[PDB]
Amino acid sequence: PISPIETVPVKLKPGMDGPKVKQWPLTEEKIKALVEICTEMEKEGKISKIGPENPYNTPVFAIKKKDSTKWRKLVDFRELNKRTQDFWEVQLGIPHPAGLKKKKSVTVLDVGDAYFSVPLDEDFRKYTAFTIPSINNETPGIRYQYNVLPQGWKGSPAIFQSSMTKILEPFRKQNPDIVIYQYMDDLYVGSDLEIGQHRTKIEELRQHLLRWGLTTPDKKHQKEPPFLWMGYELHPDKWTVQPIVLPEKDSWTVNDIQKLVGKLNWASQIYPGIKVRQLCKLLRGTKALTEVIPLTEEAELELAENREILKEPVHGVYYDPSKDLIAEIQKQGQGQWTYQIYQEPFKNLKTGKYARMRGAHTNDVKQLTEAVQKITTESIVIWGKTPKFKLPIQKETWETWWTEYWQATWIPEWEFVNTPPLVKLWYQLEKEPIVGAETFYVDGAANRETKLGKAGYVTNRGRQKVVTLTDTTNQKTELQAIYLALQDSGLEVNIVTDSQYALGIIQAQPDQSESELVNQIIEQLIKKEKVYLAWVPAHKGIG
Amino acid sequence: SPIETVPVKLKPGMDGPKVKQWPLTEEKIKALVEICTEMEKEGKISKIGPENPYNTPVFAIKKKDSTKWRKLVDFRELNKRTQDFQLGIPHPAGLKKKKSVTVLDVGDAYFSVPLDEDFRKYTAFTIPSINNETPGIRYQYNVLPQGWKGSPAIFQSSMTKILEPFRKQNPDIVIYQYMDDLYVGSDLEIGQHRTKIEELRQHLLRWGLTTPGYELHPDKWTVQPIVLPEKDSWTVNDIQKLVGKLNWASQIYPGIKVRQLCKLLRGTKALTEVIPLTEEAELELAENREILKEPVHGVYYDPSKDLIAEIQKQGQGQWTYQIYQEPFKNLKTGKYARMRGAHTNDVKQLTEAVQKITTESIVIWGKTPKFKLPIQKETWETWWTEYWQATWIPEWEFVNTPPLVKLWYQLEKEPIVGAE
Numbered sequence: 001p002i003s004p005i006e007t008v009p010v011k012l013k014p015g016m017d018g019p020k021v022k023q024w025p026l027t028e029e030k031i032k033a034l035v036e037i038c039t040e041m042e043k044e045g046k047i048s049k050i051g052p053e054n055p056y057n058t059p060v061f062a063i064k065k066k067d068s069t070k071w072r073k074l075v076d077f078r079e080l081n082k083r084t085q086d087f088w089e090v091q092l093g094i095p096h097p098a099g100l101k102k103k104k105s106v107t108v109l110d111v112g113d114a115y116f117s118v119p120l121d122e123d124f125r126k127y128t129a130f131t132i133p134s135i136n137n138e139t140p141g142i143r144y145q146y147n148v149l150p151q152g153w154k155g156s157p158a159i160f161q162s163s164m165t166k167i168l169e170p171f172r173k174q175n176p177d178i179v180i181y182q183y184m185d186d187l188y189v190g191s192d193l194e195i196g197q198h199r200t201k202i203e204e205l206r207q208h209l210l211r212w213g214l215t216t217p218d219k220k221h222q223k224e225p226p227f228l229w230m231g232y233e234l235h236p237d238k239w240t241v242q243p244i245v246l247p248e249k250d251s252w253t254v255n256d257i258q259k260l261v262g263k264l265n266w267a268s269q270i271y272p273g274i275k276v277r278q279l280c281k282l283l284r285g286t287k288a289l290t291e292v293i294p295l296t297e298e299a300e301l302e303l304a305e306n307r308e309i310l311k312e313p314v315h316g317v318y319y320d321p322s323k324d325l326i327a328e329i330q331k332q333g334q335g336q337w338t339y340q341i342y343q344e345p346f347k348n349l350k351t352g353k354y355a356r357m358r359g360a361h362t363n364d365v366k367q368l369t370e371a372v373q374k375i376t377t378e379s380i381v382i383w384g385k386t387p388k389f390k391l392p393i394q395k396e397t398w399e400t401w402w403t404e405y406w407q408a409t410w411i412p413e414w415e416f417v418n419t420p421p422l423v424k425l426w427y428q429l430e431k432e433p434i435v436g437a438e439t440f441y442v443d444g445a446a447n448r449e450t451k452l453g454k455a456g457y458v459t460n461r462g463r464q465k466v467v468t469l470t471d472t473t474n475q476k477t478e479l480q481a482i483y484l485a486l487q488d489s490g491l492e493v494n495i496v497t498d499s500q501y502a503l504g505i506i507q508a509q510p511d512q513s514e515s516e517l518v519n520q521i522i523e524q525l526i527k528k529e530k531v532y533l534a535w536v537p538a539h540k541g542i543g
Numbered sequence: 544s545p546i547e548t549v550p551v552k553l554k555p556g557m558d559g560p561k562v563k564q565w566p567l568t569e570e571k572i573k574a575l576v577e578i579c580t581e582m583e584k585e586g587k588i589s590k591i592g593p594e595n596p597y598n599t600p601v602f603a604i605k606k607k608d609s610t611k612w613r614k615l616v617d618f619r620e621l622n623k624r625t626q627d628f629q630l631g632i633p634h635p636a637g638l639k640k641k642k643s644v645t646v647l648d649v650g651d652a653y654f655s656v657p658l659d660e661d662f663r664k665y666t667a668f669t670i671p672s673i674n675n676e677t678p679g680i681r682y683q684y685n686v687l688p689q690g691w692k693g694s695p696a697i698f699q700s701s702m703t704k705i706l707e708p709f710r711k712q713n714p715d716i717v718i719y720q721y722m723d724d725l726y727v728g729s730d731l732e733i734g735q736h737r738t739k740i741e742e743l744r745q746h747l748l749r750w751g752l753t754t755p756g757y758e759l760h761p762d763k764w765t766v767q768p769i770v771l772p773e774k775d776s777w778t779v780n781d782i783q784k785l786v787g788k789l790n791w792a793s794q795i796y797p798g799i800k801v802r803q804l805c806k807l808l809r810g811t812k813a814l815t816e817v818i819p820l821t822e823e824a825e826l827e828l829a830e831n832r833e834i835l836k837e838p839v840h841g842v843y844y845d846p847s848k849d850l851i852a853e854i855q856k857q858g859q860g861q862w863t864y865q866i867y868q869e870p871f872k873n874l875k876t877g878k879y880a881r882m883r884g885a886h887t888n889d890v891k892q893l894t895e896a897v898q899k900i901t902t903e904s905i906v907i908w909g910k911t912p913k914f915k916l917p918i919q920k921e922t923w924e925t926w927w928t929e930y931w932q933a934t935w936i937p938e939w940e941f942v943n944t945p946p947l948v949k950l951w952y953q954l955e956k957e958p959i960v961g962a963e
């Protein structure tokens with residue numbers, strides 16, 4: 001049924017004109033059908049016939065919908081959709097189950113073909129014109145146009161949403177103890193009323209929309225809890241993680257592995273422990289997407305251990321606003337953190353994990369800091385507030401690092417939690433030269449073009465060394481110079497270099513890096529008891 | 544209660560802003576919901592549909608000495624896209640020199656004035672909902688928006704008139720309007736300055752708008768010299784440190800030389816080894832201290848070029864900055880110590896810092912600097928608004944501090960005792 005709602009004014013993108021595409025030829029059956037179907041909505045006032053003063057056209061198709069050996073229709077609005085203006089935002093981002101509060105009951109109403117309930121701006125209707133031909137392409141084709149928002153058209157979702165919002169405003173005002181959330185063509189209503197009462201209000205609302213032409217579905221098929229809402233199995237009092245089925249199989253294709261690793265990765269958010277390191281290996285060197293790969297037994301043992309993790313199902317709890325939010329984090333490995341946000345211990349609202357590709361140069365604390373921050377942003381998106389943090393790092397350690405680090409950084413109110421393993425400062429360069437320690441003056445150079453270099457050092461104690469490198473580069477050389485001094489030095493060492501990169505390290509004091517070389521240097525820095533590193537400008541006298 | 548409206552337009556070719564709303568806390572979505580239902584009533588804003596695709600971020604803040612939430616919109620994008628423009632707002636050169644200046648919030652004035660019907664769309668904004676459980680509440684401005692650049696433009700006239708009598712009756716005072724504010728400076732002692740300011744409000748209040756230690760003190764903002772250390776005896780290490788500093792510094796002052804000191808540095812000696820200064824080193828040094836006793840000659844501000852502010856965290860609560868237009872030709876530079884109470888957080892300290900520096904830029908050249916911040920975007924975006932308290936918002940980019948530019952400025956001079 002059409003409705004008495006103000007139409008939303010709609011225009012084509014800057015300087016474009018309506019669609020003008022030809023209509024495919026059709027079987028006696030696919031034409032017969034569409035003629036029946038259109039005469040239908042035609043009588044419903046949903047679509048109206050148009051003459052030749054309309055030069056536009058969109059391709060109508062006919063496909064017998066599954067589980068109905070009866071004929072249905074489909075209009076191809078691709079082109080019109082290209083030429084239509086943009087709207088603000090149909091689907092901001094998805095609400096997360098952990099952000100809902102429990103309700104005694106939740107009911108869903110199918111405001112189904114309600115797109116055909118809302119009317120289309122009269123002016124725009126012309127662009128929606130379409131044709132039903134005839135058998136032998138006689139003379140005319142039977143032409144029509146939508147007087148109502150068409151299923152498939154770019155604007156339908158947005159307009160349909162704003163419309164429904166107006167329409168629910170009065171009911172919403174009178175019943176603030178009730179909750180409505182529209183998503184697509186489903187009205188999800190929930191509340192804490194005694195069930196009879198709740199039943200009553202829905203009927204009320206059902207009559208309200210009904211005043212607006214928006215008819216609701218037969219008893220023969222209404223939906224009931226749990227609700228499958230993209231990934232979760234939602235109950236009014238608790239949510240549950242819907243089944244993740246790993247096909248146990250005989251022979252495995254590259255592609256299959258990709259999809260497999262895809263799913264397993266989505267999974268790890270809720271089930272950390274899931275792993276894919278060996279399963280990823282089966283990819284190296286793959287020549288085709290359909291080439292079969294032999295499952296290394298390291299891969300069997302892993303594929304196995306994951307079917308087990310995905311056995312134990314998981315249930316979470318909804319949000320209670322009268323309680324504090326707690327976010328706890330753990331470092332699973334280098335650059336790997338896991339977290340769980342909960343209100344009542346062991347009663348988790350949400351969990352997740354992060355892998356941090358070392359990149360240029362970082363340190364564990366900096367990395368913790370980014371975890372907190374990523375967590376902090378998602379908490380604000382979910383519960384409009386940020387968690388109290390329980391963190392695996394001492395207050396002493398954090399104070400030392402941050403007060404001195406070169407970049408501005410911060411961590412919201414938090415508290416140390418002694419859950420091993422704690423994140424700590426792997427090493428710290430001394431601030432002034434060490435007394436009673438050897439001093440290596442290191443230097444390294446390479447011919448940019450030939451990639452031929454030398455690296456070495458001489459010390460205040462008489463020692464010296466030098467090495468020749470093939471296929472090297474300048475930075476490598478300078479670094480290598482530093483590596484050697486570290487290797488041959490002993491527990492305490494002073495080292496002078498004119499390397500630019502040394503300035504980076506002195507500043508950042510990274511504990512991870514992309515460079516296997518910087519990494520070697522770092523392992524070395526860690527082993528020492530005391531290291532003072534110093535930079536002097538290049539090519540001046542100093543040496 | 545409208546008037547005839549001045550048509551505003553987007554610079555040619557441009558299209559409206561379509562900036563995304565940053566997530567907000569419960570606390571502030573509530574505050575804005577209230578703030579907006581009210582203004583909607585008063586006819587200042589109006590709900591809109593989906594047919595409007597533009598958007599600009601919003602948020603709420605509270606001024607120190609304010610415990611009543613204030614709505615602040617981010618119009619930087621709109622402003623960049625808004626045509627420039629008889630009263631056009633000129634910057635004097637007098638408050639740079641005043642003994643004191645006072646900033647006044649006259650943002651309220653604009654809401655009286657209607658804004659052209661066809662430019663309203665471009666002012667669309669959104670109050671988002673928690674966990675996206677609801678769609679956003681979209682509004683748009685019917686009157687002149689606060690923090691928009693067209694706003695003090697259009698209200699120029701009304702403003703000149705409103706003021707003239709305080710003006711002509713006190714030409715010993717300066718008044719500067721930079722967007723939602725009015726800087727009011729005088730050399731008159733505090734007694735007369737404070738009292739004369741209050742009078743000025745009353746002068747304003749009288750025409751309608753409420754217009755609200757704290758006092759500023761221009762050109763007490765002197766640039767400091769770089770002082771070089773002094774020891775009884777120098778070590779290999781002190782010299783190396785000192786030499787690396789000077790070598791870089793010579794990009795600013797080309798008369799700084801490092802050869803006689805570098806000489807003492809030939810020879811693989813132990814860093815803790817003490818070295819006495821050759822009389823040739825001693826002079827070269829004394830000669831550098833001199834070149835350093837004053838700012839580089841030749842740096843002149845150029846109205847048609849962007850102003851740039853760079854900050855370096857120095858640790859222990861300290862920060863150093865430099866305003867310039869051309870690298871190494873600084874117009875001003877300085878040191879900032881953390882505000883009492885910001886003892887556990889950098890983002891707090893840094894936004895305070897940014898605010899003070901922007902203010903001075905305004906006073907001096909009436910222009911906001913583009914900032915270069917020693918912070919990761921994510922860290923800044925997540926928490927900057929929490930502590931922001933100014934009607935305007937300057938431009939910024941996130942960077943990585945070269946270690947050298949940091950060692951240099953740490954060297955700036957400080958009061959022998961302080962201010963007492």
Ligand SMILES: CCN1c2cc([N+](=O)[O-])ccc2N(C)C(=O)c2cccnc21
Nearest residue numbers: 095100179181188190227234235236676
């Ligand atoms: C209150 C309705 N509802 C619910 C809310 C919601 N939102 O706010 O975005 C999204 C989905 C949703 N669904 C489908 C529910 O089943 C539900 C379950 C428990 C509480 N509120 C639930």
